[PDB]
A paper describes a structure:
The RecA family of DNA strand exchange proteins exists in all three kingdoms of life. Members of the RecA protein family include prokaryotic RecA, archaeal [name] and Rad51, and eukaryotic Rad51 and Dmc1. These proteins play a central role in homologous recombination, an error-free DNA repair mechanism [for reviews see 1]. Members of RecA family all contain a central ATPase domain that is preceded by a short β-stranded polymerization motif (PM).
In this study, we present the crystal structure of SsoRadA 31 overwound right-handed filament at 1.93Å resolution. In the final 1.93Å resolution crystal structure, SsoRadA protomers are packed into three extended helical filaments in a 98Å pitch helix with three protomers per turn. In contrast, chain A does not contain a visible NTD and has an average B-value of 48.2 Å2. As in other filamentous structures of archaeal and eukaryotic RecA family proteins, a conserved amino acid residue (Phe73) in the PM is responsible for the assembly of the 31 overwound right-handed SsoRadA filament. Phe73 is docked into a hydrophobic pocket (which includes Val145, Tyr177, Ile190, Asp193, Leu194, and Leu197) of the neighboring protomer. Intriguingly, the overwound right-handed SsoRadA filament contains ordered polypeptide backbones and side-chains in two important structural regions, L1 motif (amino acid residues 219–226) and NTD (amino acid residues 14–69), compared to those found in the previous lower resolution P3121 form. A surface charge potential analysis of the L1 motif reveals a linear basic patch on one face of the motif. This linear basic patch of SsoRadA L1 motif consists of three arginine residues (i.e., Arg217, Arg223, and Arg229), with their positively charged side chains directed upward. Surface potential analysis of the entire (HhH)2 domain of SsoRadA protein revealed a 92° arched basic patch along the border of the second HhH motif. Two lysine residues (i.e., Lys27 and Lys60) are located at each end of this arched basic patch. A closer look at this structure revealed that the linear basic patch of the L1 motif faces the arched basic patch of the (HhH)2 domains at a distance of ∼25 Å. Together, they constitute an outwardly open palm structure with its inner pocket containing five positively charged amino acid residues, i.e., R217, R223, R229 of the L1 motif and K27, K60 of the NTD.
Author numbering: 72 to 257, 282 to 323
Amino acid sequence: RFKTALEVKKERMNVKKISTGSQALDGLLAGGIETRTMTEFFGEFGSGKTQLCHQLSVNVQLPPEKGGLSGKAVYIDTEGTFRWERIENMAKALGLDIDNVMNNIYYIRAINTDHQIAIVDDLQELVSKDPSIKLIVVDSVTSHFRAEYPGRENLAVRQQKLNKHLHQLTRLAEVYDIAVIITNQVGIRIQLKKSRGNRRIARVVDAPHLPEGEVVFALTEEGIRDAE
């Protein structure tokens, strides 16, 4: 039939969140990763940030009753650490179908700063031609900017470009209703710190709607999960 754009906004405006696989982490996130928002995970190598980028990429495919949005993911690789083998282990843990899972994850390595900005330019067309995409992950988003504008001498210029790039990401998330996650090796900012063994701690460092505080979770062979 013939609708009004107001009906279309009401029918589509509902809060969409994507589970991390850990109930505890979800709690810290008021349910999970949210569309129309950019969420950053930052911390040291192995703190959990990239692993989360792999996990969320599969969970997004899960139906709503299982924590996903029956959507697809784009995984933009900055330092070439993306491993399908991890995606493989995770979709297996959930009993999902591997070839399909892997099939629903667009992937690309951004080789340098200009290619990284170009890719992000191109996503509108991609998410435009394919409405099933509900997740964009940009791992180590600052990597190439730090390597291309090194030192506190170039600090200001670096801040300038990055801010611009990250703005494009926000615009994308809000106009197309997509969840964007960026990670950094160091609206919502989450620090990740190594705890004992495979345990890791997550704490809200910036998020006006999220209660400040931290939680504990684990990096397991099956994926992101609650610590034993």
